[PDB]
Amino acid sequence: STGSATTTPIDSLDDAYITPVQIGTPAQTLNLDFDTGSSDLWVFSSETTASEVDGQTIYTPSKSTTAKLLSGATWSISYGDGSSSSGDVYTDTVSVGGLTVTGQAVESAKKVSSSFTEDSTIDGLLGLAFSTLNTVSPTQQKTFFDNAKASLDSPVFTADLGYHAPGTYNFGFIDTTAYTGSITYTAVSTKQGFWEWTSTGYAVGSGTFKSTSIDGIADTGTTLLYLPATVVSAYWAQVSGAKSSSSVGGYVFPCSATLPSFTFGVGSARIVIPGDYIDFGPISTGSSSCFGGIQSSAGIGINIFGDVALKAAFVVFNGATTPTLGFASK
């Protein structure tokens, strides 16, 4: 089997991407944030504290003839940005782009933190990291991909995120029309439960490539590119007036600037992130200070190849017995 679904930016800055997902019988369609950095499929629901719901579409398990309470199961997750959610668990039928998994754990939120409430466009998360990170207790549950994998034509999914435009998540096949040149594959460590890999280096604009190993995660659920402070300083040094602002919480730059590109290495191959991809717009409405799309990972503890990086590539998440990651230009 295969599936193919369009993923759409939630706003004009590509702050995140949402993908429609069918849950239950009859189908209830929710727009979920596909997140290769976590492993819980959780949704706003009829059980979510009323004051914490503000415009989201909810899953109502009592209206699904295929929903079953997973008795005694609870979940609770906290992400790197300090956001969180928790609740109980149902199993139900879940379909993405024509690919159906029966008995998928659908984690129903009883509580969500303020940033989730405040984002009316995201109805939940669909985790695509390794199932070892799943938070359901006392019986850990599998991700949608982990459940689908054996049925797929090939045990892979691909992320093809757009810049200020829709893109595609495919399951079970590689669309050879969706990228240019060849796909370069690189090793993955699953030891921390992430799609963790090692970039071979970077360049800023038309500058020379610096060969250096940068270990990080391929994370569709993080907006920006978070890299070591040395690398980030080398980038922003090429932008007149750019500076790290403790009050704003990262590098800002004059909105009048033309940003240089940023290149990262995948083996001997190179992925080029155009300068425009690194502009996240005014820090507040009407400001001439703009927020940067490349930020230091120093406070985080891991480097993160988030959407800013991934959207410059066609990315293969290869779930073979020994997982790997593939990157192509597009």
Ligand X SMILES: C[C@H](NC(=O)CCC(=O)c1cccs1)c1cccnc1
Residues that bind ligand X (CB under 6 A): 35, 37-38, 79-81, 83, 125, 219, 221-222, 300-302, 304
Catalytic (active site) residue 175: no
Judge contact between 202 and 273, C-beta under 8 A. no
Between 18 and 125, CB nearer to ligand X: 125
Backbone angles phi, psi at 123, to 5 degrees: -90, 0
Q: ∠ at Cα 66 (65, 68), nearest 5°? A: 105
Q: CA–CA separation, 140 vs 147, rounded Å?
A: 13
Cβ proximity to ligand X, 39 vs 104, nearer residue: 39
Task: Give 96 or 269: the residue with its C-beta nearer to ligand X.
Answer: 96
Number of residues that this document lists for the chain: 330
* Distance (Å) of CA 75 to CA 43, 186, 253: 12, 33, 40
Compute the least distance from the CB of residue 218 to ligand X, in Å: 11
Least Å from the CB of residue 130 to ligand X: 13
Q: How far apart are the first and last CA of the chain?
A: 25
Tokens representing 245 are 């602002």
Examine the residue annotation and report whether 71 is marked as an active-site residue of this protein: no
Q: What angle do CA 112, 115, 118 make, to 5 degrees?
A: 95
> CA dist 41 to 97, 195, 256, 259, Å?
16, 17, 41, 36
**Catalytic site residue from 33, 35, 146, 279:** 35
CB 124 → ligand X: shortest distance, Å?
A: 10
Query: Residue 308: which region, alpha, beta or left (left: phi > 0; alpha: psi -120 to 50)?
Result: alpha
Q: Which residue has its beta carbon closest to ligand X?
A: 80
* Nearer of residues 45 and 222 to ligand X, judged by Cβ: 222
Q: Name the active-site residue from 38, 86, 131, 199.
A: 199
Query: Cα–Cα distances in Å, from 186 out to 130, 198, 317?
Result: 17, 8, 10
Nearer to ligand X among residue 158 and residue 297 (C-beta): 297
Provide the annotated active-site residues: 35, 199
